[PDB]
């Protein structure tokens, strides 16, 4: 019937799988297992009619760079994820992920998704970043990159606390349907 295919990409350990499992099942994964590929599906009512939202979970690992794009055909919307407390992941949105998805799927919309926002005001995390003179990514900085890369929208969330989490998918859904 009606379907939306959403593919989620981004650096290793930015939180793609936690985002998906937390959203689709309201549980938080209890151990980190690197993803190769996983495929989830839920139903969402949109103006009172059911859509199947297919969520494709992909490897952040570079060794899956040649296999990953085999999952891309007929994608309706991408989530390009970076952790707001990992500057390297944010740089790779520009240097790796948006170039990759737009090469394969030039007409397909994507959202820039900042993850792990609960750690933005976490003293231990800030301390850890400050060791290497790093700083978290601010919303203003992310919005600027989203505009420059022609993302539909920048959204952010915490899979752990679920703050912003439903809104991420609401915006992905609307982007797929616009």
């Amino acid at each position: 019937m009606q379907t939306i295919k959403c593919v989620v990409v981004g650096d290793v350990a930015v939180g793609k799988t936690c985002l998906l499992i937390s959203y689709t099942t309201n549980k938080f994964p209890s151990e980190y297992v690197p993803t190769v590929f996983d495929n989830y599906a839920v139903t969402v009512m949109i103006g009172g009619e059911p859509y199947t939202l297919g969520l494709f979970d992909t490897a952040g690992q570079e060794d899956y760079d040649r296999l990953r794009p085999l999952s891309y055909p007929q994608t309706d919307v991408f989530l390009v994820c970076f952790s707001v407390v990992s500057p390297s992941s944010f740089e790779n949105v520009k240097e790796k992920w948006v170039p990759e998805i737009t090469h394969h799927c030039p007409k397909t919309p994507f959202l820039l998704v900042g993850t792990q926002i609960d750690l933005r005001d976490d003293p231990s995390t800030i301390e850890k970043l400050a060791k290497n003179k790093q700083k978290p990514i601010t919303p203003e900085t992310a919005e600027k990159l989203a505009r420059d890369l022609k993302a539909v929208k920048y959204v952010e969330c915490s899979a752990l606390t679920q703050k912003g989490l439903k809104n991420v998918f609401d915006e992905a859904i609307l982007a797929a349907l616009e």
């Binding site: 689709t24 495929n39 969402v44 199947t52």
Partner: peptide
């Protein structure tokens, strides 16, 4: 209220996967 989207409802039929990726799936699925 026209762009309101419900909470997700579990256990829908997963969308088709390219057959060659089938073996690379799971266990998280």
């Amino acid at each position: 209220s026209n762009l309101v989207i419900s909470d997700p409802i579990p256990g829908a039929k997963p969308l088709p996967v390219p057959p060659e990726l089938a073996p690379f799936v799971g266990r998280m699925s």
